[PDB]
Symmetry: C3
Subunit: 249 residues, 3 copies
């Protein structure tokens, strides 16, 4: 825990353009680790907000025509402002609508992290999550995080596999959508983030999940979600170091 | 608990076009019973989503001009794909805006379940809940579920009255809006669902509400809502069978 | 606890045009105190709804071009109907977009309460929270509530400072955005509310927060949120009277 300490003290302004199902949970997750979430969606204020922000999350979970042109416009505003973009191509494999939009976005702007599941990342570039992540990294030259049973991170010349979390995370809507926001909270305006910042963001989230699911008062997916926020708020270096399970490839 | 066991194993894709106050809760409810919710609202992807989905929920709780034309278009796309629609005419009796919209929708598309309170269903058709449900069934030839102190379901040649749930359920926003999603999770792509699927859906919800409200850790409407999700996640056959209360059944 | 008793019995219909991060939490907080929330955003039903409503909340937390004209239109419809408006100029200091919009809104319609933090209310008008609140009152001739470490209320010829609540509230998104909706719930269709109603609304919220944070089962910001809703639901006169901390 190096980056988390800085999030708690500096309260980084983390702009979220995310889906309607997960806005509240995203904002709450960010507040629990000390970040300052802002769900600004008006392109008319992007320039002034982005000047002082630390990152931008773009998540297309509920993409519609109302969002398309605005997302492209704000991504260009972010690039111009040097504001790092975390991009979550939610369910891109499920429609030609989403595929065509994600291709247009990644042809129009440079993003700093692409986060998804194996199937989503595979649809972007078209078996192993590591192989998929490496192929995507070669195409976009942008950090890749593939979430799954084990999580994969590829940045620069390094690929890492992480093994933390809980099954109850799959049964909470926008767990993974919140993870995209947490990653944005760890960037501190670095458009080419150190792999160590990405490893800490994913590990903080998954170790908090693991600890929450062990709490005596966790009785299922409903009670888990408040206990995850509490555990993120309290997470300390001892717990982190005892629990982290990482290995290189 | 025949259908709930199948939801947990098959993980049915359940598309929800629902109101902004209850999206998250609705998705979490569906996940807790094993379904796979998707809040897709773009008509441009409805054809590809609906081919593989098991039902669609349409709920007009926060209806605005931005939604009107899109709802009509996706209902038609559902009808063309054979995808069952669960329609929740939220607060239809409260404005001419909502009345006119709901009338237009039901003239444009065939829905598979209409779910509402007695006042909502009465406003649609222009009396006890059973009489209102039967009149609505005669007009739309579509399953009707009327929620209330007792719940009423009319489908095919039967009318049933059910008696489960909790007072805390009225103090949680989108409890009922979640019920419309749960129902959609029980349809398995049947455009004329068996009444037994509707009975199980309403009973699973109300029994889970009852048991959550009895939990020692339930301290009010705030702690109830996480407990309801847990109870839906854990609900078993023994608890279902011990608790279910059918009040009366009429045939034909 | 005069007004809260009446909310529980009368179940006032409280229209909320609020931001997409806090809609569910706002509706739940209102339901917990006995109010009847309705998140109606269609100008086409504003006239019928507002006739029977007790107040309207306007909160610009996620303001976009899709909202601008509609907000102006429904604020005018509220004025015509005699429906009191609570206005929360969320982050107004953060962009010229929001500054321009809030200026236009307050030139187009008369609101009944303006609620914000000190930096928001200062950006609206252009040292301490009391001074800012008095200057805003002199400009808009409208009750002002400034939230902070201590809360400030200015209405008519009185200014009050309150000292209740919990740090945990700042770590729960739309706590403050809920307070706007709770204030609306205490208006009972009074376009010039008594300062006592505003003091009660803010005190109920803050005392509930303080009691929730002391619960043995409150383990942080995540468990706090459900416990705040429970504590609003159960809050009684005895606890209110024991806990209230008011001055000037
Ligand atoms: C976090 C956030 N972003 C826009 S609105 C909102 C809730 C607090 O005002
Ligand atoms: C359930 C759902 N539907 C669109 S976005 C979302 C949350 C998980 O991505
Ligand atoms: C409180 C509320 N307002 C609009 S929709 C909704 C939930 C179901 O009416
Ligand atoms: Mg994803
Ligand atoms: Mg209904
Ligand atoms: Mg404010």
């Amino acid at each position: 825990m190096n980056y988390l300490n800085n999030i708690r003290i500096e309260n980084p302004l983390t702009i979220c353009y995310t889906n309607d199902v997960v806005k509240n949970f995203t904002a709450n997750g960010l507040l629990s680790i000390g970040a300052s979430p802002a769900m600004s969606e008006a392109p008319e204020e992007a320039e002034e907000f982005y000047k002082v922000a630390q990152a931008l999350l773009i998540n297309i979970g509920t993409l519609t025509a109302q969002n398309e042109q605005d997302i492209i416009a704000i991504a260009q505003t972010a690039n111009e402002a040097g504001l790092p973009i975390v991009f979550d191509p939610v369910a891109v494999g499920a429609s030609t609508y989403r595929k065509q939009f994600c291709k247009l976005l990644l042809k129009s702007a440079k993003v700093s992290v692409i986060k998804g599941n194996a199937s989503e990342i595979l649809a972007l570039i078209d078996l192993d999550a590591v192989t998929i992540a490496k192929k995507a990294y070669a195409i976009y030259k942008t950090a890749i995080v593939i979430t799954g049973k084990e999580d994969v991170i590829v940045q620069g010349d390094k690929a890492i596999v992480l093994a933390n979390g809980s099954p109850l995370l799959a049964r909470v809507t926008g767990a993974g959508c919140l993870l995209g926001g947490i990653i944005a909270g760890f960037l501190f305006r670095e458009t080419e983030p150190d792999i160590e910042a990405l490893i800490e963001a994913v590990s903080v989230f998954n170790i908090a999940a693991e600890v929450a699911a062990e709490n005596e008062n966790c009785g299922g997916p409903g009670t888990f979600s408040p206990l995850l926020l509490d555990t993120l708020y309290h997470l300390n270096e001892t717990t982190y170091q005892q629990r982290i399970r990482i290995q290189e490839v």
